[PDB]
């Protein structure tokens, strides 16, 4: 499956504008500072129709499992309770989180040997780049 290109363990190597994205989302100062220091791993695997994405870090270990197009409840690493839907659109995993009349989108793209992750909240974008670990 086309989704195979995502499978593996990916380690954060660069981040841009993540603090301002986090402010836009509404993340509090202490969480911004501690989460911003971390170099998480993103562990993606597929079993049948179920995709699992784990985030492992000094800050928080999180895991989501989902089927594309099927909404699920997610507690985020900043402790928001959101409703999420993940789809594949033109080779990009598109993750929408909805809560309190707000929305943020996280797009995961394979580019070269990297996983490029674009996070958008209103007018504010952050890009985070992960490489195989
Ligand atoms: C909207 O979600 C964006 C992402 C994410 N969001 C957040 C919140 C702050 C903004 C709202 C959620 C946090 C704290 C982390 C995180 C987790 C552990 C950490 F140790 C550091 C940051 C991660 C993250 N997870 N994995 N890599 N970054 C970035 C790309 C992927 C998921």
Domain extent listing, the chain: 2-132
Q: How many A from CA of 40 to the centre of ligand 1?
A: 8
Experimental technique used to determine this entry: X-ray
What is the best residue among 60, 77, 80, 107 to mutate for testing ligand 1's pocket, by most ligand atoms within 8 Å of CB? Answer: 77
Resolution of this structure in Å: 1.3
- Distance between CA 41 and CA 17 in Å, rounded? 19
CB atoms within 10 A of CB 89: 9
77 CA to middle of ligand 1, Å?
6
Gap between the Cα atoms of 83 and 74, Å rounded: 6
Are the C-beta atoms of residues 132 and 113 closer than 8 Å to each other? Answer: yes
Evaluated on CA atoms 40, 12, 38, 103, the torsion sign reads negative
Selection from 128, 131, 132 nearest residue 35 by Cα:
128
CATH domain 2-132 topology: Lipocalin (2.40.128)
What number of CA atoms fall less than 13 Å from residue 6's CA on the CB side?
23
Please choose, from the candidates 22, 37, 16, the residue with its C-alpha nearest in 3D space to the C-alpha of residue 104: 22
43 contacts 53 by C-beta, under 8 angstroms: yes
Q: Which residues contact 78 (CB under 8 A, 6 or more apart)?
A: 22, 25, 27, 28, 31, 35
For residue 35, how far is its CA from the centre of ligand 1 (angstroms)? 7
Calpha distance 93→31 (Å, rounded): 26
d(CA 73, CA 68): 14
Q: Is 87 in contact with 94 (CB distance < 8 Å)?
A: yes
């Amino acid at each position: 499956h086309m989704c195979d290109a995502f499978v593996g363990t990916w380690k954060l190597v660069s981040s841009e504008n993540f603090d301002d994205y986090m402010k836009e989302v509404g993340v509090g100062f202490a969480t911004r500072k501690v989460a911003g220091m971390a170099k998480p791993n993103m562990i993606i695997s597929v079993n049948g129709d179920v995709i699992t994405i784990k985030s492992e870090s000094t800050f928080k270990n999180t895991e989501i499992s989902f089927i594309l197009g099927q909404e699920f409840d997610e507690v985020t690493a900043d402790d928001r309770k959101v409703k999420s839907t993940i789809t594949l659109d033109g080779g990009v995993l598109v993750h929408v989180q909805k809560w309190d009349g707000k929305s943020t989108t996280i797009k995961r793209k394979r580019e070269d040997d990297k996983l490029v992750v674009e996070c958008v909240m209103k007018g504010v974008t952050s890009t985070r780049v992960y490489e195989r670990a």
